[PDB]
């Protein structure tokens, strides 16, 4: 029958054009794939001045709000903090969150099993006029974290400019590429701000723009902390010129339900010696967690993958043909 042969030839032509357009053209089967070796360096330029009650104006610079000063990929930018100054190890009332005592017999000497704040001395001392807390041995000023300033202490963090420098190299092809691609110039790096459409190649990122692109409001996130994931994808083709290869930036927002564990926070201390006594300043920093992830591959023409793809296509064709023949026979 003529129509049977027509259907067979149509099926073989379909599978042939499918394999040819997909394995070779679409999926780049004639190009080897390798993995980039990458290193990310980050620099933040911004300044914010905080004026808390009872304290002088505090100037925060790049060394201050960037705790991973060595330019790590996973860095935290300080946006809100609680400062407990002049902490010294001595005996005083603990925080009321741990426990509340009405008499000295209630307190027991030892360490708390859950959320230990210090070594209990077994004495109940008044934390303030109303309630009393068991006396512990720990840094004496105990941070009350219950009050979270509604206006962010560093609401200026939104405009802080952020520069990301990424250098990727493929080992098998011995090709090195950097984010600061050709189009970028020193003059450009002075007056550009990153945008999804306007300035895709500008390496200077605005913190507020990055947060808003992820899908989070900067103010509410800075009030309680947050996590933002920036991914740099280097899809590269070596058959073309290296100028074509460029870094694509994608912003991903990592969030969670606000009732439980809202935002991101950590505690850090600055140890110093004043008047011959060792003292420290405890800070509970509510900041936005920025993670840089670089994943990419390079493709360059090679003879062995081309021959293997040709053989696989011939095998798939010769199969499809025998399968169609057996189907038409039965």
């Amino acid at each position: 029958n003529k129509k049977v042969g027509v259907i067979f030839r149509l099926i073989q032509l379909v599978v042939l054009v499918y394999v040819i357009g997909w394995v070779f053209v679409y999926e780049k089967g004639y190009q080897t794939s390798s993995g980039l070796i990458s290193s990310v360096s980050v620099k933040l330029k911004g300044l914010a001045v905080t004026q808390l009650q009872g304290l002088g104006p505090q100037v925060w610079d790049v060394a201050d709000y960037v705790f991973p000063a060595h330019g790590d990929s996973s860095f935290v930018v300080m946006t809100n903090f609680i400062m407990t100054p002049q902490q010294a190890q001595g005996h005083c009332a603990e925080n009321p969150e741990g426990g509340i005592c009405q008499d000295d017999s209630g307190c027991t000497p030892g360490k708390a099993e859950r959320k230990a704040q210090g070594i209990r001395t077994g004495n109940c001392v008044p934390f303030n006029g109303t309630v009393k807390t068991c006396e512990i041995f720990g840094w004496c000023p105990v941070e009350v974290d219950d009050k979270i300033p509604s206006p962010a202490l560093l609401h200026e963090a939104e405009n802080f400019t952020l520069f990301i420098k990424n250098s990727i190299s493929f080992p098998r092809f011995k090709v090195n590429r950097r984010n600061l691609v050709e189009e970028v110039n020193g003059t450009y790096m002075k007056k550009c701000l990153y945008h999804k459409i306007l300035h895709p190649l500008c390496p200077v990122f605005s913190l507020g723009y990055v947060v808003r692109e992820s899908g989070q409001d900067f103010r509410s996130l800075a009030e309680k902390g947050g996590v933002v994931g920036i991914t740099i994808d280097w899809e590269c083709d070596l058959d073309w010129h290296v100028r074509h290869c460029k870094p694509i930036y994608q912003f991903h927002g990592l969030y969670g339900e606000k009732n439980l564990s809202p935002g991101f926070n950590f505690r850090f201390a600055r140890h110093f010696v004043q008047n011959g006594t060792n003292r420290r300043h405890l800070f509970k920093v509510f900041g936005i967690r920025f993670d840089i992830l670089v994943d990419g591959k390079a493709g360059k023409f090679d003879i062995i993958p081309t021959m293997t793809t040709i053989g696989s296509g011939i095998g798939i064709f010769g199969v499809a043909t025998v399968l169609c023949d057996l189907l038409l026979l039965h």
Copy 2:
């Protein structure tokens, strides 16, 4: 022949059941898989008081033993340390390990080729009553680490509550998930401790439990340090509800031969200015290394993978047909 046809039909039904079951349900071929983007946030609540001979009581809060303050995925929990206080730059004798001199002519001015402790002035000074070491220009006094305390200075950290906050997002499906799940609530985290069977979803991990579940003993590991690897694996079947998505926590113990470089250790310093002179405190910290590795995939029903799996199954059936026909013919 009847028996030949029966064997042929049996082989056909067997390969049909195989291609309809294995690649579809077991391998989830109709689903497509996307790697997660994740961020690790770790908070350790605990307090340990270390009493050292010649020094006052030392309180080590969360910021102290957790050296990475920004909540990095790889963090070290301090278990034992060697403290050398009041280090100042000057000319003081070197450690006996570097060299032993009996006369001033033996010492050579310059810097030692390997593991230099300072700039040798060229004079042999008595390090102590018995042996003499060449004078060097370095921090004073030089740290001595020949003796490691057999009882861990921080042994209370066996009980330290470790809270891991891991937020994942799949870019292909645009679904954000966190280690905290609907089953876990605010009242649950107050008293729960992670267990392999009892509390698999509790985000609070005990350090001793993590060490014991990794095939290591905390008591022996705390003396010289160690490396414990925690892997959080997410397997998600987006065909079901998102409540079924639950993280899987696996603890892997990374250990080596005790004879050659046992445990993990590092040295850090705190710089301060006392009495108009720059001084520092050098600590040789023996701590357990914790690495959080999050690797997972999610699968949702899609039309193109389903069609590809159907085509692959039909192709496998076709050849299982002829392979059987050619064998029965022989």
Copy 3:
């Protein structure tokens, strides 16, 4: 025809030898592969003394030039720095590169839009005898990074030694391996310098050797910074003894155009309280970025992969035979 049968048997023998040798031995189809869990700990030893104008001799020990105390995979080794001692908050002139005014009416009170150095007060005080800049609120000694010392302040960094301790474990096969191998002993590490041929397995890497093997000159890197990538690769056939399992160390040079953003740099501050006044020392450190990446796979004989490979080979054979038969059939 006899020639047709000879050609058929020749093609049969060719495809049989192929499916018996290539996929089995070269591809290790009978073995299974699993990803390892790796944690890297780095330790450096070396001392460098920097003598500056006015300031006394400064000793930079391991804790100084190694900014990551814990020793993460990504660490920076200080080679050159710019120190602005005794930075105290107050009113001072901004940097001349920021802005220059001839009259006080030029500057406007507020915060700069880009790269803010402080809060302008609307007054112009002379930065030096020639030009005058806007008066800002912040650290009084402004850091001037126009002059970079051509001789590296820490050129002694080239010969500093680097010890890398990596422990890898395959969870599927429950086998733990370390960079320290049976060939390496305690007396060997005392004097081993890593080399590609002479000493392949020693974990003591010379910084200058690592920089030179990556393809970069240390002296140029020392002045303005650099990036060096070290990759450890483990390929182990668990069918043989575990002694054969040895890591492979490869150095990759990550560099970019020197005209735009040459080298790697960052700023960190040391906060201290002297004379009841909070001051800091700001250092602009030019250092070489070192990144450690570990990847590997292991192979163990298993029954299911062997059976799957045998089935795939039989299928490829059965197809090749008939495809050849159709070829002759024409």
